[PDB]
Every structure is written in C-alpha cells, then in structure tokens.
Amino acid sequence: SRIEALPTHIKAQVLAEALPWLKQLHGKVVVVKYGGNAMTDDTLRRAFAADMAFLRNCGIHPVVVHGGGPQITAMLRRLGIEGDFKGGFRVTTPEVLDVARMVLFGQVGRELVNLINAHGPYAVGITGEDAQLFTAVRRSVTVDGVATDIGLVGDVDQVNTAAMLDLVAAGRIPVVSTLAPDADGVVHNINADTAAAAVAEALGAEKLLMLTDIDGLYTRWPDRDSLVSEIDTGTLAQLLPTLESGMVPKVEACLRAVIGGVPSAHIIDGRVTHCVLVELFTDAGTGTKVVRG
Amino acid sequence: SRIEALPTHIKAQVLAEALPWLKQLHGKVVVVKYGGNAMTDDTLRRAFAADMAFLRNCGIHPVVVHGGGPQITAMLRRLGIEGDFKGGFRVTTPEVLDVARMVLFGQVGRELVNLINAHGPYAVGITGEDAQLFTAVRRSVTVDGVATDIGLVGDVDQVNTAAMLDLVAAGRIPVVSTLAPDADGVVHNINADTAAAAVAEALGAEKLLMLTDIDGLYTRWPDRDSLVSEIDTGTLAQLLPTLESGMVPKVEACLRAVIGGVPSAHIIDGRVTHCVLVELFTDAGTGTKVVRG
Amino acid sequence: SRIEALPTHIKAQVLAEALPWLKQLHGKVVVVKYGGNAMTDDTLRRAFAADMAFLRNCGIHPVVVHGGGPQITAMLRRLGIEGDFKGGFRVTTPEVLDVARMVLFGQVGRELVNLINAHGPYAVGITGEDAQLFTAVRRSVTVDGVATDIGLVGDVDQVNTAAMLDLVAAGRIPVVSTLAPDADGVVHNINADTAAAAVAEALGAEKLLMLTDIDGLYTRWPDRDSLVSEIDTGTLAQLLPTLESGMVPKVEACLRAVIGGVPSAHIIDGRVTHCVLVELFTDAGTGTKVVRG
Amino acid sequence: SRIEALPTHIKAQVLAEALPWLKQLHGKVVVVKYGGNAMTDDTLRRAFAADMAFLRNCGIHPVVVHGGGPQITAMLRRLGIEGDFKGGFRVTTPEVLDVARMVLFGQVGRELVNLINAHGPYAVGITGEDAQLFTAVRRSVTVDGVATDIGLVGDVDQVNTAAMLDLVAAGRIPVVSTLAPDADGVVHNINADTAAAAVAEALGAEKLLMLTDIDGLYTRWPDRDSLVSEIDTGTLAQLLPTLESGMVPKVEACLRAVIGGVPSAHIIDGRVTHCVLVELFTDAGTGTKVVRG
Amino acid sequence: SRIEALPTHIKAQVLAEALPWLKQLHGKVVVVKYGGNAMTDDTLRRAFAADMAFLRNCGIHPVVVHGGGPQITAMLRRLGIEGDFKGGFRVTTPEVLDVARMVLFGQVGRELVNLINAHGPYAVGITGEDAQLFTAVRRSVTVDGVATDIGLVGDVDQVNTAAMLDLVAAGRIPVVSTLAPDADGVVHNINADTAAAAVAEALGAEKLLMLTDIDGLYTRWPDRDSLVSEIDTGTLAQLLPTLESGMVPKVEACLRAVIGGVPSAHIIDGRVTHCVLVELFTDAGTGTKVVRG
Amino acid sequence: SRIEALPTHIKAQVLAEALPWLKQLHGKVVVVKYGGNAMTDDTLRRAFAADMAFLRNCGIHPVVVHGGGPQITAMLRRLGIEGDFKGGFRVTTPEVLDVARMVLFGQVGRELVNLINAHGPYAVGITGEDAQLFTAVRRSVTVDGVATDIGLVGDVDQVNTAAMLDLVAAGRIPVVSTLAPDADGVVHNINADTAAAAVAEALGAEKLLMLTDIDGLYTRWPDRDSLVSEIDTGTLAQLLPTLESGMVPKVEACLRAVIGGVPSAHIIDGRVTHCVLVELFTDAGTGTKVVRG
Numbered sequence A, B, C, D, E, F: 001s002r003i004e005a006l007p008t009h010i011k012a013q014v015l016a017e018a019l020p021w022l023k024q025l026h027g028k029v030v031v032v033k034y035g036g037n038a039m040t041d042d043t044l045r046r047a048f049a050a051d052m053a054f055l056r057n058c059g060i061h062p063v064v065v066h067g068g069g070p071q072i073t074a075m076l077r078r079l080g081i082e083g084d085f086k087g088g089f090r091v092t093t094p095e096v097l098d099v100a101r102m103v104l105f106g107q108v109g110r111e112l113v114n115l116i117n118a119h120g121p122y123a124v125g126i127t128g129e130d131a132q133l134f135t136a137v138r139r140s141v142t143v144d145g146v147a148t149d150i151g152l153v154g155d156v157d158q159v160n161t162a163a164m165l166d167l168v169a170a171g172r173i174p175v176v177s178t179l180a181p182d183a184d185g186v187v188h189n190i191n192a193d194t195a196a197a198a199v200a201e202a203l204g205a206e207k208l209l210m211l212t213d214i215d216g217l218y219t220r221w222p223d224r225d226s227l228v229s230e231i232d233t234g235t236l237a238q239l240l241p242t243l244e245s246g247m248v249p250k251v252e253a254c255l256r257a258v259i260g261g262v263p264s265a266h267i268i269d270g271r272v273t274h275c276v277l278v279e280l281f282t283d284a285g286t287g288t289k290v291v292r293g
C-alpha cells in the first residue's frame, strides 16, 4: 500500500537482481503444483494467477498441476455418498471417481483457468483424457502391512511429451487436473503431488515448485533451528521415514523429479503472497531447494 | 450381424457412392450438435463417437457441441438445490451455474471425449473459458410479454475464430461445453443449439448438423404427408411460429447458421445408429436440409 | 441401379465397417499396380480412377504403377517394326524402346491421368527420367539355360525416395510409367510388376496391391478348393515353381515387397468393379494377402 | 577448341560483363520456346540443355515450351493415317491428337528431359493434363474468309499459376508439351508459340525467349539493312501484316506476351550454339528485343 | 548492498507491480537512445547493458541507438585535424566523416556490444551501410538566418523496416551507429537523437526512450515547480522555442516519433542507475512522458 | 574496352565453360581472404566487390575475411603511439588493440561493405564480438627460441557455426574483421590469414581462396620453372620451412584448412583484375591449388 515510501533506487535494484533468474528460466518449462491455502484464500489465489501470467509474459513456460482433496470429500457428503475405508484410505468406486473428476476438472480447474485468464488468453484446462495426453496405471496401497486395492486410483504411466510441449509452445498455460485413462480406457484419479513430479520429469522441466502450507523442510520438527534451505536427494531420501505424514508426498515428489533429472525441486510456503515470484526471482526465498546427489 | 449375406458387389457400390460427399467435405469444418437419445443410449453414443473418428480419418474436421439439460437438473435435485422459476424458466443463480458447468464440462463432455478417444488421440474438451476461445453476452427472456432476467444465461458473443481453427488443424476434435465468460469475466451457460449455430458461422463450417429425436421437419404435424426433406430459410422462417416448442430452438439455429453463410444446416434423426454417416455420405438421409433463400 | 431398395440401416453398417481400415491407412502410402482388363474396359477403368480419388479424399496416398505390354506390341505392328526373339522374349532395340516409351508414357499413362483428373487436380505422370526419380540396371534373361541379352530392359535400381514423397505430400497421385535411365543415362523399359514392388519398398508403403485377371492364388490350379486367401512368404516362395507362367511375376513382386518390409501385398481380381475399394475397406475381398514369415 | 590461346584477362572481362544480367534475372522466371534446328541438331540440342542447367545453377528459373510439328507429321505417315485439309490446315481428328500427344509428350519432350538431366535432377515433363496445370479452349481458323473447325486444336485458356510456380520453386525445370483439356476434359493440341506467350504471361516471366531459324526481325525482307534489334509493340503490331508466314506466329507471341506485361520478349537465332547464353548474358546478341509501347 | 534488510514481502510487491508493463511490452519494439553520462560512467554503462539483457530475457525487443559527439571531437584533436566552423557547427569534410564513422562504429558501438554480450549472444552492431538497412538525405543548417552546407551530415531517409525486424525476431539486439549512405552511396553522419525517432517510427516501436542528463522537462527552467511528468505533443510543440539548446534535439525527437504514431516517447534521467528499468516497470519514474494530442 | 572486336561465338564458349564450376559451387560456402594490393588499388577493389556480387547472384555463398596490417600501423603513427617490439613483433597493448579494432572494423571493413553494397543489399560487417560469433584464444610467439607474450593477439578459438550460416542463408555476405573476445570477454586481434582458415573449416566451406601479391607458389624461388599449380598437403607441409617469410602465413592457412576437410585451398594473384572469377570459373587460373594428401 504505502509502498511508494520506498526510494526508487531500491525498487530498481530489486528488479535488477531478478536478471540472473530471468536468464536461467528464459524459454524453459516450470511445473508448479498448486494446492493448500494458496488455493483457498482469494488474495493468494489472485496472486498465484498473476504470477503465472508474469512467467508467461517473461517467455517462461509454466505448467500448473492442481489437487483438491477436501473439495471432493465435501461434494461426496453433499451427494450423500457413503465412503468405504480400507486403512485410512477411501475406496474409489466408479461413483467416487465420477465425482472426483467432475469436482477437479469442472470446478477446481475452472476457477484457476478464469483467474489466470483475467490477464489474457493463457490458461487451458485438461486431463490425461484430452488428446491422450497421459495415461495412468492402477496403484495398490500397503496398509498395516498388506498391499490392498482401493479402487480407481493410480500413478501417471506415460506422458505425451511431444503433444504437451506443442501446447506450451503455442503460448498456453496448461492447468492440469490429474485424471487419466489406463490402457483399457478406464479413468483413474492420480495424486497431484506425484503427478506433478512425473510431468516435470517428462517435460524436461527446469524447476518443479511444490506449494505447501509450511516454511520449508524441518529435519527435527519442531526444532526451529532444524529448518534447512538446500538439501541433496541422498540426504533427503534417508530423512523421509522420519517426517510428518503431510510432508512425505511432497518429499517423494521432489526426490522422484530430481532423480529423474529435473535440476531442482522446491518446497515453498504457499501462505506467502507471490511465493512463486519470491522463490524464482529473489534470493530471499523461504522454501527448501532439492538438488541431485 | 448377418450382413455378410449381402453380395460384395453392392458393398462396393455403397462405398463408391460416398465419393462426391468425401470430395465436398474434404478439408472442411463440420459442426455437429450432439444431444437427445443419441447421448443417452450406449449403442448410439458409441456409433456417434465412431463417426467423429470416421470424419477425422477422412481429413474432415468435425467440431462437437453438446448440451445436457436433463443431467443438470438431476444433479440439482441430488444436491437439494431448490429452483426459482420465472415463466417456465429456472433462474440461473451463481450456484446453479457452478453445477451446470461442473456437469456439462466435468461429466457430460468427459464421456464423449473418452468414447471418441477410444479410436485415437482426437478429442479435446473445452469451454469458452479456455484460451478465451469465445465469450458470452447475458440474455434476457420474454415471458407472457415482458423481458425478464433469469440469471447467468446468455448467447455466444465473439468467437476466437483463429485459435479455434489452429486447434482443428492440429488434428483435434473439439468437444465443446457451452459456458463462456462475458466481458467482465463472469461465466454464463449458453443454450447448446444456438451455440452450435454461432460456432458453425464463426468457423466457416461447410455443414451444421443438429441431432434431434424426430424424423425431420413436419410442416403440419402430425400429418405424415407433411414431412419435408429440403426447405429454404425464407419458407422456414415464416413456418417457425407454428411448430412444437421442442422444434423451435433447432430451427432458429439452422436459420441463423444458414443466413450467416453456412451452406447447409441439417436436422437429422439422432435415434438412428450412425445417423451422421447416413446424412453425410448417403442420399438416403431421413433428415431435412436447410439452404439459403 | 435399384440399390435404393436396400434399407438405409445396412448402408450405414457398410460405411461404419470401413473405419478400422480408414485408421490403418490414414496418412500412408499405398502402391497399386494397374493392368489387365481393369485397364481395357471403360467401366472398370472409370471405377479404378474413382477409387484413386477416393483414397486421396481420405487422406491416403496412392501411387499408381502401370504396364501396357499388349499396346506396345500393337503399335510395333502398326509401325511395321519386325521383332527379334531370343527364347520367347522380344529383343528391345533402341527403336523398340522409343516405341515402348512413347506408348506407355504418351498414351497409356495419359488416359489414366485424365480419368483420375476428372475428379480433381490429382494425377501427375512420370517416368524415372523425370527429376531423376529412379534409375534402372540392365537385366539379362536366362533362356533354356543360358543368360542372354535382350536389349534395353532392366530392373529398378535406385529410387529417389525423398523426392517421390514430396510429390505425394503435395497431394499428387503419381502415375508411373516404368522407364528409367541407367547410370550412363540410357533409358530402359522395366517390367511393371517388379517396378511396383521396388517402389512400394522404397516408399515404405503400407500395402502393395496387384490388379490381375484371376480370383486369387490357387495352389493346385485348377482345383477350386485350392484357392487361398492369406499366405506367408515362406510358404509362397516355395510354391512359386509350380504356378502358371502368368502368375509368377505377380508372386515375385509380392515376395520381394513383403520381404522388403512392406506389411502386406495383395493379389486382387481386377475384373471386379471397385476391386480396390473392396480389398481395402471390406472383409469380403476376393484376393489373397501375403504377409512376412 | 584452341580457345586457350585467348588471354585470360579477356576471359575475365567476358565473365564480369555478365553481372548486370545475372542481377536482373536472379530469382526470376524465364520462359523459353524451343523449336527449329536448335531441336534437330545434336550439338545445338546439347548446348541448349546445358544453358538451361546454367540458368538453374545461377538461381534463375527457366521454363521450356517445345513444339514438334514435323515429327507429328512423320509419325502420321508412318502409321498410314491419311490427313484431311481445310485450307492449308490438317484437321485434328481424335486419332491425330492421340498421335500428336504421344509424339510430343512421349518422344520429343523425353529427349529434352534426358539431355537436361545429364547435368542434374532438374527436368520434369508435363502437359496441361498433369495436376490440371492448364486448360485449353477450342480454336477455329479463318480460311480464305470463313471461320472453320479443324478439330481438337486450341489456345491456352487458364493456367494454374500457383501450382506452376511451386514446381519451379522446388528447383525443377518444367518441360512443357502443349496439350491440355478443355472444360469438358477433352484434350486439345495447342500451338507451341502461342502457348509460350500465355505461360510467360501467367507466370509473371521476366523474359520470353523464342528460338527460331533466322537472325532476327527483318522489316523489309530481304533487305539486309532492314534488320532491327529493338522494336516496340506499337510499331511491331502494325508491321505484322507484311512479314513471311513463318514469322507471324512468333511475332504474335511476343506481342501478346509483352502487352500482357512481360517486360521483354526476344526473337533469337536458334542456329547459334548457346544462343540463350549470348542473348541473356552478353550485349552481342543477334536477336531482336520487343518492349511495350 | 544492505538491501537484504528489506522484508521479502515488499521485494515481492515490487516485482508483482511490474506485471502490467510486462504485458504491455511483451513482443514489442522499444527503441532506446543511449548517450550522456549513462555512456561515460562504468557503473551506469554496465547497468544499461544489463537492462537491455533484462528486456530481451522478457521477450521484449530493444533497439539501441547511440551517439558519441565528444569522442569524435577528441579523436579529431588527437589526429591534429583542424576544424572549419560555419555558425557553431563543424563542417563534416570527407576526412571528418571517416573519423566519425571509425569512432562511432569501431570504438563506441563496440564497447556497448561487449557489455551487453557479457550476458549472452545478443548484441549486434550496425550502420545504415550494412545490408542497406537505412539511407540518409543530406541536411542543410540555417545559421543566423541562411541555410548553409556543413558537409556530409544528414537525416535518416528510408529505413529497411522488413530487414530490421527480421534481425530483432532472430533475438538480436541491434546497436546502431548512425551513419548511412545517401542515394549515390556516399556516407553521411546522422544526429543520433533524430535517428532514434526515425527508427522508432519505422519499426512501429511501442516506446521511444531518450536517455539524457536531466530529471525531465522543465517548462520554466529553472523553477523547480515547473517540472512536468506527462505532456501532449500539441502543448510540447509550442513550448519548444523556449527551452535550453541542449533540450531541443531531444524534444524534436519525441515530437516527431509520437506524431509518427509511436504511442509514447520518454525523456528520462540517464544519471540514474537502471533508469530503463525504473521507467518501464515502475510508476516512480523521474522522466516525462510525451503522448499524442 | 575494344572487347567487342571478339567474335560472339567465343564469348559464348567462355560463358559455357563456367558451367561445371557453377554446378560444383551452387549452394556452397566459399571463404575469401582479401588483402594486399587487391585492397589498395581502386580498380582491383571494385572488381573484387563485383565478383562477390557475382557469386551471390549465382546462388553461391561467399564469406570475406580481411586484414589491414599497414593501415593499423599508419594510424598508430598518426596518433603518436610509440610501439614496443619483442623480436620483430609489435606488442599489442590495450591501446594498440582499440586502434586495431577501430581501423579494421570502422574503416577497412566499411569500405568493402560499401563497395559490395553498390550492387545490392548484400554486405554486412562483423567481428567475433557480434552475437558472440566466434571467440579467440591468446597466442604466444616464439622469438629467437623462447615463447613470449606480445599482448592481446590470438587465434580463433570456437566459431558459432550455426549462427554464421543463418546469416549467409539469409542472402548476406559477411565481411569479417578478425577481432574476437576470449573466454573472459577481453578482445584480441587475430591474424587474418589464420582466421580465414579457421572460418573456412568451421563453415564447411567448399573452397578457401587466399588473395596474395604473387603468381603462386614457387618451390625454389626465384627459379621461374619452379612454380607449381597443384600441390598436396603432405608435399606442401614439408616445403614450408624453405619459403619466404611473406608466404608462410598463407601456406599454413591452406594446410590447416585442407587438413581440416576443406576440399581445396587456393593461393591466387590478387594483382589480377577479377582474379576470383578467373580462379573459380576458368581453367586458366594463375594460382596454385592445395588438396589433401
């Protein structure tokens, strides 16, 4: 607000210090997993949508992957669809998937498309179903020590890398809803964190960003001194069995992406307005960067 | 089934008689409004999806526009969302639109995309929201003689003709869900019959096809002798005030399309398996063809 | 004629059953050797020309190779050019070749070009001389057990695969007259059956079709029960020394093409109107299909 | 032969003086009517073919149009085909045209294609039949004062200007045999001099060259002092009714071409070895240049 | 330096507020006249070069025009070349131009090319001589009331708009030294301020920036309250006869550019580090903006 | 002058005998090192510039590399810049390089650009600094037996082969001034003879031409009978330690180029008007050709 009280010779140096990162990312793919409160608060949402327009007006190629777990389960309760739970996991019947698909693609992805498109004709929504852009393989879960079927849920199988980069080269910002047909054409819901890692690897992304609701990776949570800002995958992979259940899907995504050759994956604070801008164009990022090693 | 009892020298002549229509339509846009029982029965649905693959494997460029009125209203009742009705028209509150959008784009369009894509990576789903492909203008209705607001409902305003034909030239079959933002970015639901006419006109379509649940246009329904097979728009426009309420949106679409320069619009029997193939590649079509005059 | 007595729901299924073959052949090269009565009767000729237009208006890329042996020898007798015969083979003097070239390229190929072009600007005539599209190597013949020279006759040597596919990608239907210069620039006449096999192999054709004047391959001619509809090259190659002299050039072509990687070569009945359409788009073909093995 | 006795500092100036004409013609179409003794003598023929390769290896785009009247009539006599003559004009029956076509396209054009192609894959032969490259309109003749039908003979009607320049831009040297279908698809023989003028006008040629068997235009033949080297069309058009019957078709071609906007047409001595090179790259040409006025 | 003491949530808002100007300028030409102390101090120079890399890594297309008057005159004195002066203007003999050209193109432009190229292969130096990119017309000067010749000095005549935008579309940053041949090929030195206006108009630039050594346009210099930040050309054109001699060439450039259709020209403080960044991406610019009116 | 006294049938044969070399060089890169009296005399200069236009109007791609040693040293004396000399080599201080660069790029290259451009928009001047087209590596010299530093002088390091051929494919004639930055961005002066060899090798040139002030390579200078016209690199490499100091840089260039795969390098007499034309298009060249062996 009263940000015009800041001298203009510091506004300059802030912009000038973005240049090495503008160079690094010019012409490159950046996959961004969008979820958490950055998806539930209107100020953060509009900032996120603005940053995706920012990237695109810098000649950078963002790709957005979104989840929406809580919204699926609220729609299920509204429809009075009673759940079945093996372990702590709801079974995804054909009925639950139809709901998941409708909610993610026809509600959650729509709002991000319209927000982004307020800045131009950039956003385009899609699932693996569209133009056979990617496929799924059914995933089983292990629960208290036995692999068990929990329905139409899976992992990304193959990605139409060629068709996906045409879409980006045409200046579009794909907004991906993670549903995809298996080899027999039956559609599965895919965890959005792991989908983002698979997409970032298939597209040769320069960075994977994971918006989450924390400052960054704590090693010995909740010691404040335990927070790290850069970590290699070797050290990170062995720290995995210690962290909170909320953190593991995000860490596995970064591990799988960086092992797959994406140069860096980042876990950043989605509660921070314009967190994408601070992580990419500033050395004052709060997140933690994962590199190979 | 026992169709191999038919001599092979008649199978030949049937295929050979498709040639003048293969020539006429080669390289051209054909917009198809898909609704009715051709959308509710599984055999007709799979035939429709196969015919869209047929067109695309002939070098013809189909564009599918779909409705889904009954499915919206069934979802509203499941969600316990009570309706408001001026005249015979449900008012489209913000809540009703979110449902309409979710149902059309995230359920109805998905099934057509997967059906078509069983034959290849052809189908791609979209609304006017995606890449700002088209806009809407709010429409008012006249009811017992006064123009009245019934909420977020409208007509197609502008169409991104250039971007839409790139999508087609890339070999994609757009499957359009008729929702679109107005100039202030608020999304409206558009009647699918009128949307199909506006799309066919914007894209320079060679033909508009309207799948409906009748043999074709009867002039003096229900006289059987009153059924016509070709009609010019002058004669058709003045016959409009006489026909059943179900027929008027389909006739207005054909009028607006053919007046807009689309060479012919067709009202064809969606209860007939492969009705698209019979109308386009055979002289034995049941429908009625509308031409300028 | 009275083919409108056939119900329209069977006309539909006939067209729908073409779809798997439209998919297989979409975008692919199909080389067709045209000769026999399909070249001497006006109804079959006009049907053949229509089918080549059919293919081209499906986004399929046909390439026509033609012979014309009997027409050469009728022109030689009209010119009073007395023949020399080693074995049963006329020696091709410089004079005979000038006649062969003039007849094949300036009479026989012209009529097919005009027939096809009645449907559009598709056909283009050529020999190996044009744009150095292919070369010939002089061939010797063995006669009662000694290899002997019979003049300017040969086999296809090299093919300008790149230039030939540009011509096709521009939407043209090449009509090839099989004459071609050797390495010293002297033009040779090439047997059209073997030329078609060499072209199909060089162009990566999906199918080679050989129009002939028989139902298909009989193994123990004339046992009617001896007719086969599919045969692998291993079995076919050893059956070669048994068949009628008229059949061997067509079988050697299929062997050389399918061994060369063309997925299937077909021997089909050129006396059947629209035989090309029945073989490619129907499961009721009379011919015999050759596959690798 | 003993041309190495010429000092090398004059060989240099000869080449350097070609430069203004290399600039003028770089990237431009040059239509060359080839006939006369330049077509009957082997040394002149091989020189002509070399000059067409020269042009093409300078980035100039030649287009060759050829006649062959005497060869048609020799083939007719060999076939014992008796002629019918209204005025001094043989009637072109269907039979005569088949012969004319076979001779021009399948004998005369072939030899020029092979000669040129001795220098590279440049030449390609064609008629108006191929790819519908141009059409004909039947022409009547006036004889001792009455317009009379003399069969399948005509004038160039329309030219596929777009398709013809693609062929040239691909680096090909078209060798045109002047036969072309009318609007009903029946093929006509076209006078090669007038065909060359129509082609030069349709293609936007920079120059039309007419090889003939004379030094150039004499005004008062046979006064030697009457020979001219440049003439405008106004003066030339009124001199037309005076000249020898052999000269009029060549003068009418130049008139029609230059009036049609071709900047200059040239009548040059086809009995001179490399006459094309001397006319285009030297100021010592023997011919006569026609310009607008 | 101690700029990390600034909270990171203000670094964010500074970057976010660049977005409307990133959108406006994305894909557009921006011509920048570079001179003054921004060209003599090493910190400002390296900042200017960095900002040109910034623009180019945003998908913006900068074009640099430079002067260098003082460096020419220092080289003349080193060479002992005595000047001739009509009015207050040195006469540009052939000798002076050779020096001016050598200094501007071979010294001054080289240093900017190397500075910019420290960030990538972006800069390319040129004059109107290269690829005939622009021409000059000799200019006369009026001195104490009479138009007088002062040698090889002129104004930009024609600009090769097509070739100049190819160079930019290839990702290059032209660095222009303002020398150019007239119609007879004799090279003239052009005032860099007026050259920048002519280039900006020819290229359809979105903005012209004029780096100068002042805060901006004062109307009643030296009243501090007289400084303006936006002015239309009508008001500016009539204020021209009042201002200091140093300001008029910069004002005439802006007038001629904005009248010529460039949407805005800006006079900005070249003594400010990263003045280009502050003017284009911040609302805190010191300069004065000129718009049509 | 009186060159029209030469019969026109010999002017023809001179042009016709250029054809095999037009074919060989069509579409190919030819690098020409321009120096010596061909650079100091106005008639030879204008002839050289005309020949570069000749090549370009034949579809040949020339690349000009120039020196200018004597002009640098005359400018140094005018500026009163006293030299330092280790061995017989002037040390290149930062000051000397600024002069060398200004003279070569801003004087010597400019005149060749304008001369060439008198024939069209062909010439474009550049150094390794522009678009990072090539880099330098500092070179040391051995003097009376010890390697010694003589300042900012070096050899070509890497060449941006891709960017250089784009420039040529756009129809431009690069005129190269041999200055180039090392890896730390500090600019070095490169011997023009060795730069030409490195450029010819990087660009895949068909020929390297070296203009010099002698008839050609003498083996036992000054025996007149000792002059050779073709020599292989094996024989040439061992003859190197015998020849005059002026000849060695030119021989080393040819050795390094031909060993590097350039098919032939030529040492030709730059005192001969149109020496480029005589060497490339005539068998009467005075020079000596170097081939691999």
Ligand SMILES: Clc1nc2ccccc2[nH]1
Residues within 6 Å of the ligand: A124, A125, A126, A130, A131, A167, A172, B124, B125, B126, B130, B131, B163, B167
């Ligand atoms: Cl997938 C897909 N959806 C699109 C919408 C607009 C343009 C291109 C698209 N590709």
Ligand SMILES: Clc1nc2ccccc2[nH]1
Residues within 6 Å of the ligand: C124, C125, C126, C130, C131, C167, C172, D124, D125, D126, D130, D131, D163, D167
């Ligand atoms: Cl080869 C050949 N002949 C042609 C005729 C028309 C267009 C292209 C062609 N290529």
Ligand SMILES: Clc1nc2ccccc2[nH]1
Residues within 6 Å of the ligand: E124, E125, E126, E130, E131, E163, E167, F124, F125, F126, F130, F131, F167, F172
């Ligand atoms: Cl490097 C360089 N300089 C140029 C001038 C004109 C066109 C292209 C160019 N590339």
